[PDB]
Structures are given as structure tokens and as C-alpha cells.
């Protein structure tokens, strides 16, 4: 039994526990069980993996999982999503720096605790449902089958405190005929470290994250698959997940209610530039283990299906040009309690009731 605990502004206290065994019983397969829990999510999985599906090193992996997501505890407009499902994945090493993945998946989603609101109800209508704008207690359940694909490039010089190279991760998903939902979703993440000096003590880091998904035919992508932005890992200085569209609630039993409750969206773009330098005023020998950075972060999340014509007087959440921006300082080092990172950032471009969070940290 391997345990772990962490603490941060993004998810509060995180617990992790798991067991793993390669070459179980001399069969050649690895078997694992692991779980994680934080302020808004409980996740558990069982895994079986053959690292030599072919002699060449193609791996075949299987996953059985359960997940419990509480949207309001993740700083979104409220809902509960209890899910479970399976995945079978083929993994291809291309060379030492590149890997490819292709897999098939099943997922069951059970949605509840949804208050009537424009974007969610719009998705339900696209699914052929006719919920009333005063329905407080509906549940929605779906069974989806997917094709999943991925590509990872990693040529960073080292895992901890990188100074040179790039990492790129592309991940995509599309539903298979027979699913309830019909949609696709693609994500791209990049990070590139460019050292200035031969010593690699001064480094420029550029990061990007892109995301796009949409429904097929008349259907929309499910809102419980939306992208988010804001927080320690995307746009610092903003509360986790606050960036982008906000829920518009229907009157109880009048007019609509604007809120500041983030709902995410089906399109997202985030970029960051930061200047990694030696740490001033520090004692000698601490310097190599303590990394200071000055950053400029920026990001947007938007809703390509927002019908601006129907909601006159409300913000146009389909507009992709409301780019949030912040600047600030970060410090990172290894402590007795594990990896330590914190930042002070000031948002200087905000929109649509985004919530600020200047001081953000993570331990573990």
C-alpha cells in the first residue's frame, strides 16, 4: 500500500492510495488498483496491462473505473456526475521521445442536482429532451462508447526543474455509433524551455493549452465534458475554473438571473510566458534547489453555441476575444513535505465576473 497526501488551492486536501504489481504471478501482466480523493472528486480504478502485446513492445492495457464529481465543490454551477466505465488501450512506442495511443472506451454518466439554467437546458434540448424551466429534480443518464487517441512527445532534459526541450500532448475522443451522446473533443498541451545562458540558470518557458469539442448533427457536446480555465495550472491569479461563461438561471416558478457561477465551455485557449531566474537574496547552495519565475499568463474559454440573438442584454459568451491576463511571481523548491510551489499574481484583464485569487499554492 502506497499512500500520498497533498494540499493546494486548486483542490484542497488530496489523498492517494494504491497497489501495483508488475509481472503478476509470472504471467507477464501488471495489475494495479488506485484511488484518489480531493474536495470535489473521488476516483478509483482497477488496471491490467500487458507491456508486450507484441514482441516489439506494443502494450495492451485495460481499465475499470468509478468517478464521483461534485461541480459546486469545483467552483462551478452545481451538478453531481457519478460515472463508471472501462477502457482498452493500445500503446505504441515510436522512438525514445514519441509514443502513440489508440483505444476504445465505455462510460456511463449519471447527472443530478441540476438547477434550471440556459446552457445546460440547451444541451438537453439538443438531445431531444423537453425539460421544463422549473424542473429542479431531474436526473439525466447516458451510455457512451468512444474511440480515443493520443500522442506524446517528450524531450525535456530532466523531469524536475527542466531547463531545455519541449513536451507536447495531444489527446482526442469521438463517440462511436450506438452512444447516447454524439460529439468529439480534442486537447493540445505544449511546453518549451529555451535556456539563455550556457549554465541554464536563466530560462524562458512558453506553455500553451488548446481545447475544442462539438456535437455531431444537431446534438451538442455534453456540458459535463466542458473545458475550464483559471487556477494554479492555467491562468494564475484567477480562482480555479472561473474563466469563461457563467450560468444564467431561469426564474423560480419573471426574468433570467445572471450569476458569477462558472460553467465552462466547449472551446478553450491558454498561453503562458515566464522568465525563470536565479533566486535573489538566497543563501548559497539553496539557489540550485530554489527556482524563481516571473510570468505572464493569459486565457479564454467560450461557448460556440451561445445564441446571442436570444439573450439581448447578456454577455456574448460565444465571443472568443475576451482574453484574460495576469502577471506575477512564482517560487518552487523541494521541502520536507514534498514539492512546493506558490505564486502571487495580479489579474489585470478580467471579464464577466471572473473571480480573483492572488495567492495560490500547492504542496505535494
Amino acid at each position, epitope marked *: 500500500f502506497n499512500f500520498g497526501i497533498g494540499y493546494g488551492t486548486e483542490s484542497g486536501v488530496s489523498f492517494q492510495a494504491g497497489v501495483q504489481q508488475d509481472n503478476w504471478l509470472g504471467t507477464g501482466y501488471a495489475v494495479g488498483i488506485n484511488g484518489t480523493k480531493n474536495d470535489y472528486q473521488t476516483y478509483a480504478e482497477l488496471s491490467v496491462t500487458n507491456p508486450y502485446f507484441t514482441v516489439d513492445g506494443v502494450s495492451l492495457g485495460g481499465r475499470l473505473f468509478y468517478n464521483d464529481f461534485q461541480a459546486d465543490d469545483a467552483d462551478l454551477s452545481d451538478y453531481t456526475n457519478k460515472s463508471y466505465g472501462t477502457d482498452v488501450t493500445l500503446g505504441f512506442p515510436i522512438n525514445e521521445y514519441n509514443s502513440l495511443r489508440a483505444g476504445l472506451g465505455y462510460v456511463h454518466n449519471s447527472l443530478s442536482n441540476m438547477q434550471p439554467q440556459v446552457a445546460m437546458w440547451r444541451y438537453l434540448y439538443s438531445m431531444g429532451e*423537453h*425539460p421544463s424551466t422549473s424542473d429542479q429534480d431531474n436526473s439525466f*443518464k447516458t451510455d457512451d462508447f468512444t474511440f480515443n487517441y493520443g500522442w506524446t512527445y517528450n524531450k525535456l532534459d530532466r523531469g524536475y526543474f527542466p531547463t531545455d526541450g519541449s513536451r507536447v500532448n495531444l489527446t482526442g475522443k469521438v463517440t462511436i455509433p450506438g452512444s447516447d451522446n454524439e460529439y468529439y473533443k480534442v486537447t493540445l498541451d505544449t511546453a518549451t524551455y529555451v535556456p539563455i545562458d550556457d549554465d541554464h540558470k536563466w530560462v524562458v518557458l512558453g506553455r500553451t493549452r488548446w481545447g475544442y469539442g462539438d456535437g455531431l448533427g444537431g446534438k451538442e457536446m455534453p456540458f459535463y465534458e466542458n473545458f475550464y480555465a483559471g487556477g494554479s495550472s492555467t491562468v494564475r491569479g484567477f480562482q480555479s475554473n472561473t474563466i469563461g461563461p457563467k450560468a444564467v438561471y431561469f426564474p423560480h416558478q419573471k426574468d433570467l438571473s445572471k450569476s458569477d457561477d462558472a460553467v465552462g465551455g466547449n472551446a478553450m485557449a491558454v498561453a503562458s510566458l515566464e522568465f525563470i531566474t536565479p533566486t535573489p537574496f538566497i543563501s548559497d547552495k539553496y539557489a540550485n534547489s530554489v527556482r524563481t519565475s516571473f510570468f505572464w499568463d493569459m486565457g479564454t474559454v467560450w461557448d460556440t453555441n451561445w445564441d446571442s440573438s436570444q439573450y439581448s442584454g447578456y454577455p456574448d459568451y460565444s465571443d472568443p476575444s475576451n482574453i484574460r491576463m495576469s502577471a506575477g511571481i512564482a517560487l518552487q523548491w523541494m521541502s520536507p513535505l514534498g514539492p512546493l510551489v506558490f505564486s502571487y499574481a495580479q489579474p489585470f484583464k478580467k471579464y464577466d465576473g471572473d473571480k480573483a485569487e492572488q495567492f495560490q499554492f500547492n504542496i505535494g
Partner: nanobody
Amino acid sequence: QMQLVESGGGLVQAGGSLTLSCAASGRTFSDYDMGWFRQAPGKAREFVARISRSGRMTSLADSVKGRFTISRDNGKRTVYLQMNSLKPEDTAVYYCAADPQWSRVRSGADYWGQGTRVTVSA
């Protein structure tokens, strides 16, 4: 004219469970939102649960939240009521109902079954 026939009602002990079924005649079952209602002796009929044409959307009365579940099988032209953790207050005749409209089927319907009786003893 579509007919609805409920079955599954019986005598059950408090804490036990039961599954009701409602079978529909004809080939138009998927055209209808479906509902379960119940009527205790001396009282008016009352809403219990409903389910959309597709089977994906459901809702439940407050008195059965967390205990009852509604589902349907459009291939078998059947809607089900799964009743767990039963109490003596659940004793009643249970009726199946069908209506073209989701919002209406919470209070009434175009088509009604003849009911199936459930008795929960303490």
C-alpha cells in the same frame, strides 16, 4: 388504442423491495413519456415518478427520493418501478400512465392502467 397493464404488486415486509412492471400494447410506446402514480385508501391519486420517451430523463416525488427508481425498455414496450426500503406508508394501488408531454405526465395523462396493489406490513 394503447393499453397499459401493470404487474408486480404483492405483499412485502417493511425494509423489503419490489419491482413493478407496466406493459404497453401497440407499437407507439416510444411516443410517450411514462409515469407512475399511486393511491392509498381514502386519498387522492398522487405522482410518484416519470421518465422521458428516450428513457434518459427521470424525476421522482420527494416522498420516494433515494428509494425508488424508474426505467424503461422501449424494445420490450415496458416501464419499470424499482421500489427499495419500503415502509408501511408506501401501501397503495400503483398506476402506470402515458402522455405525449413531459411536463403534463407529472400530474395527469391520456392513458391509464388499471393498477397493481402493494401492501407493506410493519
